[PDB]
């Protein structure tokens, strides 16, 4: 065959050659001695800046059908003018939308990519007040949250400037909820976010004392002290969680939030950088009922679960872990579809990947992806992903973790 | 140089320094990961002479005598061999040794926790298939020992590049028959459908149930392989019955006691072992996920799902997820009454996790592939999914191996 990684499909048999990673501009954590492939996360100037501007515009271009024209020629000789003098460059508006939808694409970690092409791209580049950014965020959670038929947005905030404060979201998702630190050394909560809840309240927050407090925003503009917002209650749409039959379930007092909005990452297009990008999509039902509510480190109900269910939970053979975190998964899927909020569970979602995958092979010959992330934290090999080989690298428009501003 | 491993339930960070003592290229680079792919697509007296000084040297400090003088002149008589004939040979004590660190370094292997203990059979005596024949057999009821199963290998005569290998053709030593139906169907086993075929061809007469224990096609050095109908008696099966659901039982599944590789390459300071077949125990979700609800083996989800009559018209009602456990719980619980050993997903991982404990301490790190040890169903129910892993070959290995044909 050809020398791109083989890739192939245990499922079905197929076989396909990944020649997209050819293209990949940027060295991962893995070298021929060891693999880093299951590390969560691993470790601008004129001449880095320019080739990265460059790369990105001729992805336009060809994105647009006009490679090698005068009007693609022309685009390139005005961005390294402005580099010239400038030291930076900014994006045309249909250059941001494109390379926003193109960094989602990009994404190895996101099995929701069948839906990258449809993704609503809030320009907020001309924000100037950390009230403002309260503003397009109050927006973009109405826009996105349309009553419970989510749709896809980003809201793209002013790009790192030389020497300049960056425009930064503290809080790691838009809604949170609180995580109280006890006396009793245990957390009231969410233990995901006692550090921010412990920052919103040193900058003036009174806390109140739930399960599921939503926390307040810490937003930053630059070179300033971050401010704080409170979302208006009717804005941030919640679903109480209870069992198709399992009756005492909605007893629990469980519930989650519609919109999966997440604020902390870096934006990266064509070496620009875009420090708050905040976007949302809808949820992945696993997400919530497998990873928020059963982690040991998060509000890890199982054992709860299990003993309303009368389940043995002295021992481990007799699955008791397994049983309850079906119940809890459907219970999150039975209750969004009650409130008509979108959901999708982890067997669509991951049909809906394959299907990805194929349209992808078709258009780029490849797609990147991170299978330990792909593959859902419940009944795995239950779904076809499990069984697909799966090529991960980096390609740029992209998203990137960024450090925390305090 | 030393990556930073972190345990993200707990908070906790290693460093893995082990990985330096890897001599050996996995399939990623730094431009792209490939550690989701399942196979990677005389040596010259240099390269086996210090392979073979490598493993020595592990031998020595592995029984604390490195450095003295039965170390210096047992590196003398491995140069004297292979300076002589190109080749050498292994010692029954550090064979016994390399086996278990085979074992140890075996990235995809969760149950290491039990790697010292390892009953080590020396076939290196065996010049027919038939006398591998015996050799299998006294293994398979060592290790079966009446349900109370005991890990254990048995180590046939290394390769030699005159010569063709000694190789089992099977994959296991025990599997069962997939038969190819005209109706593009499979009845049985679909992994197997090739095997299957090639026992036929070597004149086997077949059954035609949905578990018929495959007979052995057992090969000597460029001798065509011999057909041998392991004695139903040395087979140990357990049938498949229910904790709750009566019905259970009635549907005749049923799955076999030990779980005997026997296809991987052994290899040993640069010396190769073709066949040498290993058995443990099972983890219940080989049996209960894999080998029964893969959509290309048994395939048995939809069936059991309208048995318990879920809705099986939609993905969202978890149909797959509940009739999942039911399989894996009926698994265990048929084990447990047979009196026939099976760890659970959950107890392998947790001393997986106490196993990655010990090797820290005693060796800086362990070589483990993520993708292959957390469990095919509850992956984050288990702690070794939220614990990051750094993979890697370490030699004493096991490799793959062409097939014989
Ligand atoms: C439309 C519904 C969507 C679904 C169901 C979905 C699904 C997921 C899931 C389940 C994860 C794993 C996260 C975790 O386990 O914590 C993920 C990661 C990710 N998602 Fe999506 N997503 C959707 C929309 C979006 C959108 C709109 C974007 C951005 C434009 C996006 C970008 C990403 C990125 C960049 C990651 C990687 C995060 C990391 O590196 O840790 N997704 N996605
Ligand atoms: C004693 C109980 C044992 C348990 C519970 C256990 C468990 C497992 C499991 C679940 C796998 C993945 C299997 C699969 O999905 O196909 C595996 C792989 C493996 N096991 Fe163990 N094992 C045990 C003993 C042994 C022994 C005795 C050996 C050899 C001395 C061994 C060598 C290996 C190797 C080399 C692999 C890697 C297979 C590959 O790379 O494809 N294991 N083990
Ligand atoms: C749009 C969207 C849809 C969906 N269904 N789920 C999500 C959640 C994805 C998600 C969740 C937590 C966290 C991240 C980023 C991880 C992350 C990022 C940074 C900057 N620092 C860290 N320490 C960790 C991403 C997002
Ligand atoms: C010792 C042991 C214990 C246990 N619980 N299960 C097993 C079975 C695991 C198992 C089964 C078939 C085959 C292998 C490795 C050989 C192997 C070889 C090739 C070419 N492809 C593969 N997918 C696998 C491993 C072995
Ligand atoms: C150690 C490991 O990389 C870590 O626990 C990962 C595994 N896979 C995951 N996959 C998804 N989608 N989300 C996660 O948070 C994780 N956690
Ligand atoms: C393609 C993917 O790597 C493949 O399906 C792997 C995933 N993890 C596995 N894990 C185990 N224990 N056994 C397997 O066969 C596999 N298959
Ligand atoms: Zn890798």
Request: hydrophobic share 40%; aromatic share 10%; charged share 20%.
């Amino acid at each position: 065959g050809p020398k791109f990684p083989r890739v192939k499909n245990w499922e079905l048999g197929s076989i396909t050659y990944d020649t997209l990673c050819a293209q990949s501009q940027q060295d991962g954590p893995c070298t021929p001695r060891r693999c880093l492939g299951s590390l969560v996360l691993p470790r601008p100037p004129a001449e880095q800046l320019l080739s990265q501007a460059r790369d990105f515009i001729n992805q336009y271009y060809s994105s647009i059908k006009r490679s090698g024209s005068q009007a693609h020629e022309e685009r390139l000789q005005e961005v390294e003018a402005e580099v010239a003098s400038t030291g930076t460059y900014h994006l045309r508006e249909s250059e941001l939308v494109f390379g926003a939808k193109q960094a989602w694409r990009n994404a190895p970690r996101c099995v929701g990519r069948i839906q990258w092409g449809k993704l609503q791209v809030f320009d907020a580049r001309d924000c100037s007040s950390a009230q403002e950014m309260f503003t397009y965020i109050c927006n973009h959670i109405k826009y996105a949250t349309n009553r419970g038929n989510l749709r896809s947005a980003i809201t793209v905030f002013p790009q790192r400037a030389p020497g300049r404060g960056d425009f930064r979201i503290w809080n790691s998702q838009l809604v949170r909820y609180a995580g109280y630190r006890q006396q009793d050394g245990s957390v009231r909560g969410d233990p995901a976010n006692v550090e921010i809840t412990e920052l919103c309240i040193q900058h003036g927050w009174t806390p109140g004392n739930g399960r599921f407090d939503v926390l307040p925003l810490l937003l930053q503009a630059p070179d300033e002290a971050p401010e704080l917002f409170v979302l208006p209650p009717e804005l941030v749409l919640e679903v109480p969680l209870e069992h198709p039959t399992l009756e005492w379930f909605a007893a629990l007092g469980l519930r989650w939030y519609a919109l999966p909005a997440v604020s902390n990452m870096l934006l990266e297009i064509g070496g620009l950088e875009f420090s708050a990008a905040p976007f949302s999509g809808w949820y992945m039902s696993t997400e919530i009922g497998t990873r928020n509510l059963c982690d040991p480190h998060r509000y890890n109900i199982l054992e709860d679960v299990a003993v309303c269910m009368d389940l043995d939970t002295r021992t481990t053979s007799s699955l008791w872990k397994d049983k309850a975190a079906v119940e809890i998964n459907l219970a999150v899927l039975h209750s969004f579809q009650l409130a008509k909020v979108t959901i999708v569970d982890h067997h669509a979602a991951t049909v809906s990947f394959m299907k990805h995958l194929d349209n992808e092979q078709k258009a780029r010959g490849g797609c990147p992806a991170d299978w330990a992330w792909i593959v859902p934290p419940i009944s795995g090999s239950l779904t076809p992903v499990f069984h697909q080989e799966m090529v991960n690298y980096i390609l740029s428009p992209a998203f990137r973790y960024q450090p925390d501003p305090w």
